[PDB]
Model the fold of this input.
Amino acid sequence: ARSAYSYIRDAWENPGDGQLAELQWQRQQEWRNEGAVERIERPTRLDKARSQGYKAKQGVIVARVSVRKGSARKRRHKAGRRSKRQGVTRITRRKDIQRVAEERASRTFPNLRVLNSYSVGQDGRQKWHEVILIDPNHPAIQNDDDLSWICADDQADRVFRGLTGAGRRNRGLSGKGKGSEKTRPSLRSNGGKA
Amino acid sequence: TGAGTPSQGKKNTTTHTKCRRCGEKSYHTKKKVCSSCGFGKSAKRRDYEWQSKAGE
Amino acid sequence: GRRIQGQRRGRGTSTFRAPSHRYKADLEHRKVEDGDVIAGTVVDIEHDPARSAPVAAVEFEDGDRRLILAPEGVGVGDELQVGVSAEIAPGNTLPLAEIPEGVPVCNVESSPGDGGKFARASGVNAQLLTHDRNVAVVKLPSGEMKRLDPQCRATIGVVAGGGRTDKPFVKAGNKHHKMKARGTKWPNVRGVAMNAVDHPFGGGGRQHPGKPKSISRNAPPGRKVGDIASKRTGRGG
Amino acid sequence: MQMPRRFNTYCPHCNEHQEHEVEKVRSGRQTGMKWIDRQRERNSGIGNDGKFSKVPGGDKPTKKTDLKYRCGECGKAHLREGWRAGRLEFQE
RNA sequence: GCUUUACUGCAGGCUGUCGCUGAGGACUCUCACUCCGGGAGGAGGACACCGAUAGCCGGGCA
RNA sequence: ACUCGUACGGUCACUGAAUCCUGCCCAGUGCAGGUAUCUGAACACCUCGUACAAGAGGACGAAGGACCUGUCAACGGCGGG
RNA sequence: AAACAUCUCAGUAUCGGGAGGAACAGAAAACGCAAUGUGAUGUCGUUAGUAACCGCGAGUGAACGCGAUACAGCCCAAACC
Ligand SMILES: [Cl-]
Ligand SMILES: [Cl-]
Ligand SMILES: [Cl-]
Ligand SMILES: [Cl-]
Ligand SMILES: [K+]
Ligand SMILES: [Mg+2]
Ligand SMILES: [Mg+2]
Ligand SMILES: [Mg+2]
Ligand SMILES: [Mg+2]
Ligand SMILES: [Mg+2]
Ligand SMILES: [Mg+2]
Ligand SMILES: [Mg+2]
Ligand SMILES: [Mg+2]
Ligand SMILES: [Mg+2]
Ligand SMILES: [Mg+2]
Ligand SMILES: [Mg+2]
Ligand SMILES: [Mg+2]
Ligand SMILES: [Mg+2]
Ligand SMILES: [Mg+2]
Ligand SMILES: [Mg+2]
Ligand SMILES: [Mg+2]
Ligand SMILES: [Mg+2]
Ligand code: NA
Ligand code: NA
Ligand code: NA
Ligand code: NA
Ligand code: NA
Ligand code: NA
Ligand code: NA
Ligand code: NA
Ligand code: NA
Ligand code: NA
Ligand code: NA
Done:
């Protein structure tokens, strides 16, 4: 039979309809008064959290992070530039807001490593995402057959190297076939062409 | 007044001094910053790629 | 070109800032719970370095010692009151509602409790004209009819120091000393006296502006100079 | 110059002389879907747009003839080399 | 380097549209949002701000 | 930033003490105001088109412009016969 | 590019952040020698200056496959407990 989780999932398919709508209208009001990074005891989207690797366990942390909406906050050129490079308004960044949110969170918890993250909505001027972080030093996790992998040295600062889920996706690594000539095994080895 | 020799005489102000961190005489005692190692501005040591030829 | 003077200003560098550290007080109306029982005695009359006009030192019953925007006709010993049921005389502060029409008023608030914004410079005063339950028309010194919340507190009388503008500075030195106490770069070099690089009116073999002086409102900073969005110019007509 | 609306001449399709009707080629309308239309959309961006930033050229003092020769029997038209003419008016 | 009704563009300003954004071609309201007020609370209010796009002006700048 | 500021303010410009004065011109340019009508982008809406789409047309029409007015101690002008 | 604006120099120089002894990638919502076919990923050789791009100017520029190197394949979320 349907899991209880399946209802959270189905509910969030339309954050602007039903109960979820009234819930967001309320929640966001408190969220706008909270800080950039806010640790929370429980994930707003349990299905998503658990689906992404979450476990109600010691060493597993969640935090909501808000980033401003829109294009790049870019400074205009202060020296000679050909017309092609004189833009300001239409320039957008190459990392998505979700990815920026993951970084802001990971920096807030220097000792933790970003496991994954998900969207929790957005109002007119900002978007919120809840990041799942892990204490690679806690024995509860060091002994977890499902998460201990994050405890490896080579996973250090994983979010800053784009090794995250949103990272790999934003790096054009989804497709294994056509279209990924310039992305795999890395953007940098492909001369930075995507 | 000439900007040359005659303007050199007023120069009795101390600025760059021996750096507690790098040992170089570049610690600007008024800014409290080392122009050589960045001590006072950066936890990381001052270093730029333009300090050497691009392919080296 | 280089940034014009109006642009340098924005940066808020030393030269453009006001000597705040020398300023005396941020003259604002008192915050009374209600009732209006609040009153105090004029202890002294001081010179306000920020407005070139007198400011009255007052001591309140509750111990509070604070300077105030002194209207004309206030001296040491006088008792000033502040509140809804305050008396209707010079130096006292009460909402426009409790103020009889036709009576000159100064240091008027824009939003009740903001401490007063309108008519605060030498000699000026507003003019309470019309009453209501919702609006209280007040004629500001510029001659504009300002519709205001009857709850907006204000002070009875004309601001002290009237007639300051009557005597000429006569000499540059006198201007120098005044300017030195405000957030203003002085003296002033005419645009038309600069180089093309420095100001839109600069350049030429003789002094005159390049284009016409009246500039569109939409003009960008660096160009908005001369007669800003003038509806007309000159005296004739 | 004056030009007859209809007259006998060789018909390349029919392969035999027949009465033809002369018409000034009316400009057909653009779809805006040809490859060039897409390249305009694609290649235009921030700053100058290269070839797409160019404006129309001038005019020649006199234009050549842009005619259509309509065959009377088979009804199929054919084109010919035009020739410089200030104005061209048809007779009947 | 400088100028402009040189070419081409870029900021910026004005303007429409979309999102935030809700109840009942002109109108009411409050609950988001904004501001005032220490607060109770008041003013404003689906506009404004912010994000996006479109037209205009645009040697301020390249 | 201006601003511990509030039009007797402060910003942006021109002229450059006092004294006698400062004429005529709003066509062009600028700025500002108005505007029946004309012009005026995109979204949404209608039509055609396409089992969808590209695309073509239409209706509505903001600022802006046409048009009208104001203004020269705005840019400037003050001749020939 | 014998000027120059798209293009080119070049995602180069330089800048911000960070890992390891190597990094990254990686067990198909693949390929598409279209098959009765291949079978994670890097890399080397080739495919090829080919296809594709481009004031269709100057210039720019892959991949599938093939031959090699080394080979390795697994764990959750949920269902039911
Ligand atoms: Cl991390
Ligand atoms: Cl002054
Ligand atoms: Cl013809
Ligand atoms: Cl194959
Ligand atoms: K170039
Ligand atoms: Mg590599
Ligand atoms: Mg010198
Ligand atoms: Mg104040
Ligand atoms: Mg004066
Ligand atoms: Mg000063
Ligand atoms: Mg001067
Ligand atoms: Mg000079
Ligand atoms: Mg200039
Ligand atoms: Mg002169
Ligand atoms: Mg002059
Ligand atoms: Mg363009
Ligand atoms: Mg505030
Ligand atoms: Mg230039
Ligand atoms: Mg060249
Ligand atoms: Mg060429
Ligand atoms: Mg290239
Ligand atoms: Mg392929
Ligand atoms: Na971290
Ligand atoms: Na790319
Ligand atoms: Na000049
Ligand atoms: Na493209
Ligand atoms: Na020069
Ligand atoms: Na005129
Ligand atoms: Na005029
Ligand atoms: Na050349
Ligand atoms: Na050249
Ligand atoms: Na090109
Ligand atoms: Na083969």
Summary: The pocket of chloride ion (ligand 2) is lined by residues C 178 (CB under 6 Å). Chain A has one domain: 1-194. The two ends of chain A are 44 Å apart (CA to CA). Chains A and C do not touch (no CB pair under 8 Å).
